[PDB]
Ligand binder design. Sequence first.
Ligand code: BEF
Ligand SMILES: [Mn+2]
Length: 128
Amino acid sequence: ADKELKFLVVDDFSTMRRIVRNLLKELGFNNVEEAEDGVDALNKLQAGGYGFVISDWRMPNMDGLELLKTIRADGAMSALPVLMVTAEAKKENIIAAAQAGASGYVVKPFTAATLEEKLNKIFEKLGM
Ligand code: BEF
Ligand SMILES: [Mn+2]
Protein backbone atom coordinates (compact mmCIF):
# COMPACT_ATOMS: atom_id res chain seq x y z
CA ALA A 1 0.00 0.00 0.00
CA ASP A 2 1.10 3.59 -0.67
CA LYS A 3 3.44 4.31 2.27
CA GLU A 4 2.33 7.95 2.28
CA LEU A 5 -1.18 6.80 3.16
CA LYS A 6 -2.38 8.86 6.11
CA PHE A 7 -3.65 6.84 9.08
CA LEU A 8 -5.82 7.95 11.97
CA VAL A 9 -5.39 5.83 15.11
CA VAL A 10 -8.30 6.15 17.57
CA ASP A 11 -8.44 4.83 21.13
CA ASP A 12 -9.20 6.53 24.45
CA PHE A 13 -5.96 5.14 25.89
CA SER A 14 -2.55 6.32 24.66
CA THR A 15 -0.88 3.01 25.37
CA MET A 16 -2.81 1.41 22.54
CA ARG A 17 -2.39 4.38 20.22
CA ARG A 18 1.35 4.16 20.78
CA ILE A 19 1.36 0.43 19.98
CA VAL A 20 -0.59 0.90 16.75
CA ARG A 21 1.43 3.98 15.76
CA ASN A 22 4.81 2.27 16.23
CA LEU A 23 3.66 -0.83 14.34
CA LEU A 24 2.56 1.27 11.36
CA LYS A 25 6.04 2.78 11.42
CA GLU A 26 7.59 -0.68 11.12
CA LEU A 27 5.45 -1.46 8.07
CA GLY A 28 6.61 1.79 6.50
CA PHE A 29 3.76 4.10 7.49
CA ASN A 30 4.88 7.34 9.14
CA ASN A 31 2.02 9.59 8.12
CA VAL A 32 0.00 8.74 11.21
CA GLU A 33 -2.24 10.89 13.41
CA GLU A 34 -4.06 10.08 16.65
CA ALA A 35 -7.46 10.81 18.26
CA GLU A 36 -8.89 10.11 21.72
CA ASP A 37 -12.55 9.44 20.92
CA GLY A 38 -15.19 9.44 18.19
CA VAL A 39 -15.75 13.20 18.13
CA ASP A 40 -12.06 14.07 18.09
CA ALA A 41 -11.61 11.61 15.19
CA LEU A 42 -14.48 13.03 13.12
CA ASN A 43 -12.94 16.49 13.58
CA LYS A 44 -9.55 15.46 12.20
CA LEU A 45 -11.26 13.45 9.45
CA GLN A 46 -13.08 16.70 8.68
CA ALA A 47 -9.66 18.28 8.03
CA GLY A 48 -9.39 15.91 5.05
CA GLY A 49 -6.49 13.79 3.84
CA TYR A 50 -7.11 10.47 5.61
CA GLY A 51 -7.14 7.18 3.71
CA PHE A 52 -7.37 4.65 6.54
CA VAL A 53 -8.83 4.56 10.05
CA ILE A 54 -7.99 2.18 12.88
CA SER A 55 -10.32 2.51 15.84
CA ASP A 56 -11.06 1.24 19.34
CA TRP A 57 -14.61 0.54 20.52
CA ARG A 58 -15.17 1.60 24.14
CA MET A 59 -14.40 5.32 24.30
CA PRO A 60 -16.23 8.29 25.83
CA ASN A 61 -18.16 10.92 23.83
CA MET A 62 -18.59 8.64 20.81
CA ASP A 63 -17.63 4.98 20.75
CA GLY A 64 -16.18 2.94 17.86
CA LEU A 65 -19.45 1.50 16.53
CA GLU A 66 -21.03 4.94 16.44
CA LEU A 67 -17.91 6.31 14.75
CA LEU A 68 -17.97 3.54 12.15
CA LYS A 69 -21.64 4.20 11.46
CA THR A 70 -20.88 7.90 11.11
CA ILE A 71 -18.05 7.38 8.63
CA ARG A 72 -20.06 4.84 6.61
CA ALA A 73 -23.14 7.08 6.59
CA ASP A 74 -21.25 10.05 5.13
CA GLY A 75 -20.91 10.21 1.34
CA ALA A 76 -17.59 12.06 1.54
CA MET A 77 -15.94 9.18 3.42
CA SER A 78 -18.30 6.17 3.29
CA ALA A 79 -15.67 3.88 1.72
CA LEU A 80 -12.98 4.87 4.21
CA PRO A 81 -11.21 1.70 5.40
CA VAL A 82 -12.05 1.28 9.10
CA LEU A 83 -10.17 -1.44 11.01
CA MET A 84 -11.61 -2.12 14.47
CA VAL A 85 -8.97 -2.87 17.06
CA THR A 86 -10.84 -3.59 20.26
CA ALA A 87 -11.01 -5.81 23.36
CA GLU A 88 -14.73 -6.36 22.71
CA ALA A 89 -14.64 -10.04 21.76
CA LYS A 90 -18.24 -11.25 22.02
CA LYS A 91 -19.58 -12.46 18.67
CA GLU A 92 -22.69 -10.29 18.96
CA ASN A 93 -20.18 -7.43 18.82
CA ILE A 94 -18.11 -8.72 15.93
CA ILE A 95 -21.40 -9.11 14.06
CA ALA A 96 -22.59 -5.61 14.89
CA ALA A 97 -19.36 -3.98 13.79
CA ALA A 98 -19.15 -6.19 10.70
CA GLN A 99 -22.75 -5.43 9.76
CA ALA A 100 -22.14 -1.73 10.35
CA GLY A 101 -19.43 -1.89 7.71
CA ALA A 102 -16.20 -2.80 9.51
CA SER A 103 -13.32 -3.43 7.11
CA GLY A 104 -11.69 -5.76 9.59
CA TYR A 105 -11.78 -6.47 13.29
CA VAL A 106 -8.88 -7.36 15.58
CA VAL A 107 -9.32 -8.19 19.28
CA LYS A 108 -6.96 -7.08 22.05
CA PRO A 109 -4.49 -8.20 22.96
CA PHE A 110 -3.06 -8.75 19.49
CA THR A 111 0.37 -9.50 18.01
CA ALA A 112 2.48 -7.47 15.59
CA ALA A 113 1.85 -10.16 13.00
CA THR A 114 -1.91 -10.16 13.52
CA LEU A 115 -2.15 -6.44 12.82
CA GLU A 116 -0.02 -6.66 9.70
CA GLU A 117 -2.08 -9.58 8.35
CA LYS A 118 -5.38 -7.87 9.00
CA LEU A 119 -4.10 -4.65 7.44
CA ASN A 120 -2.74 -6.37 4.36
CA LYS A 121 -6.04 -8.23 4.16
CA ILE A 122 -7.81 -4.86 3.92
CA PHE A 123 -5.40 -3.46 1.33
CA GLU A 124 -5.98 -6.62 -0.67
CA LYS A 125 -9.76 -6.44 -0.53
CA LEU A 126 -9.77 -2.81 -1.69
CA GLY A 127 -6.96 -3.08 -4.23
CA MET A 128 -4.57 -0.83 -2.33
F1 BEF B 1 -11.82 0.13 24.75
BE1 BEF B 1 -11.47 -0.64 23.46
F2 BEF B 1 -12.74 -1.33 22.88
F3 BEF B 1 -10.36 -1.71 23.75
MN1 LIG C 1 -10.96 1.98 25.13
